[PDB]
Amino acid sequence: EWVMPPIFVPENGKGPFPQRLNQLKSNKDRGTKIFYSITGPGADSPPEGVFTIEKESGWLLLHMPLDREKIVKYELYGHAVSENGASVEEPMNISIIVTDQNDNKPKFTQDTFRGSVLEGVMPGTSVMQVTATDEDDAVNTYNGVVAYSIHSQEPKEPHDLMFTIHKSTGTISVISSGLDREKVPEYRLTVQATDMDGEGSTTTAEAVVQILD
Amino acid sequence: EWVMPPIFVPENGKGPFPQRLNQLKSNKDRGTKIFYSITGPGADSPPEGVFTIEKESGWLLLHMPLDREKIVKYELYGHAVSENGASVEEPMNISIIVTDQNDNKPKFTQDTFRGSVLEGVMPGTSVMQVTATDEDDAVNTYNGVVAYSIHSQEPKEPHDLMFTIHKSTGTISVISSGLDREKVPEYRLTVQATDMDGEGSTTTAEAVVQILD
Ligand SMILES: [Ca+2]
Ligand SMILES: [Ca+2]
Ligand SMILES: [Ca+2]
Ligand SMILES: [Ca+2]
Ligand SMILES: [Ca+2]
Ligand SMILES: [Ca+2]
Ligand SMILES: [Ca+2]
Ligand SMILES: [Cu+2]
Ligand SMILES: [Cu+2]
Ligand SMILES: [Cu+2]
Ligand SMILES: [Cu+2]
């Protein structure tokens, strides 16, 4: 059986609407006047109205720019029915997949994270864990893949490189010895999350580490 | 059977190329890797290469801007063959119709027409017939429908309106009496053929009428 191929539609389309995606046809046009229709989430089910089909021509229509972050793929079904009201074709699967654009910056779950670590802890230890999320595609592209780093550390005593972060998980570790509560009680780190695995747009949040002698 | 609908492609399309018209798919993709091809005048037959198809994806491609005046309609067939070398679908007819643009001016059969009429002829008689052709569509549009007229007459003696031309057939007639061989031997008319039934682009040729005793 010949089947309609899935339809790839890049999100945030600028062209005019409605947009013609594809066109259905039943070879039983020769014998009788045929009428086309579509059903499924996106047509007659919520979100209703996004996809429609011209009853007599069979043109699949898109009325709104799509947002991949909202719905990545729609699973609709096209129908063909003679004047009799009875279907003359088995429903056809119309898969409409939305391609991703990097239109979302990373966002930290919280503006500020609080953690704590002890005095004589050996380098390579865990302190706390911060997390940021990017709603873009993180499977086929890097538009959604988040990378972690540290922008600055205050104060810069005894050293400027007192902590570190795993680029993928975002858990902060003690990199250098010399932690002392009597000297410095709190460490204000400004952590950074950037998409494109470090090559794209960036956002920042605060991570407070109190020391425990 | 769900079949691919005809494909309308306006002639003289700008880029980019190749252009994706439609895409084929056999649901036997589920079982085996399928390979696609197309045959017929326009693909493998003259004019060869105009339409081709990506073997693994099944994208129908157009490689050159089309000219309707050359070929109005292509009748191709798409094939699906499994990796094993066996056809998995009955060939499907991919009909590609080219819609017309008004890109052809009328052309007179001759750069100059020679005709003759007698001196004492009564108004309303026929003299000669000029003809121009438009290679554009004259059935669905008026891009090819030609209308005739007279731009000038030299000399303009005894009168400026000595002749006339039927707007449809293009046969020149004497509208006014007063033809004299002793006074004026030749009449250099510059006749005009314009498409759009008189409202479009125009071209002109000359029609020389010698008068006879
Ligand atoms: Ca989006
Ligand atoms: Ca996106
Ligand atoms: Ca992103
Ligand atoms: Ca042409
Ligand atoms: Ca034309
Ligand atoms: Ca024309
Ligand atoms: Ca005489
Ligand atoms: Cu609309
Ligand atoms: Cu700064
Ligand atoms: Cu090409
Ligand atoms: Cu002139």
Curated annotation (Swiss-Prot), chains A, B:
Record's function text: Cadherins are calcium-dependent cell adhesion proteins. They preferentially interact with themselves in a homophilic manner in connecting cells; cadherins may thus contribute to the sorting of heterogeneous cell types.
GO cellular component terms listed in the entry, alphabetical order: adherens junction; plasma membrane
Organism from which the protein derives: Mus musculus (Mouse)
GO annotation (BP), single: homophilic cell adhesion via plasma membrane adhesion molecules
Biological classification of the source: Eukaryota, Metazoa, Chordata, Craniata, Vertebrata
Chief localization: membrane
Molecular function GO labels: calcium ion binding
Protein localization: Cell membrane
Protein name: Cadherin-3
Domain comment as written in the entry: Three calcium ions are usually bound at the interface of each cadherin domain and rigidify the connections, imparting a strong curvature to the full-length ectodomain.
Sites where a glycan is attached: 93
Stretches assigned to the Cadherin domain: 1-108, 109-213
Highest taxon, organism lineage: Eukaryota
Keywords from the UniProt entry: Calcium, Cell adhesion, Cell membrane, Cleavage on pair of basic residues, Glycoprotein, Membrane, Metal-binding, Repeat, Signal, Transmembrane, Transmembrane helix
Quaternary context: Interacts with CDCP1 and CTNNB1.
Coverage span on the entire protein: 100 to 312 of 822
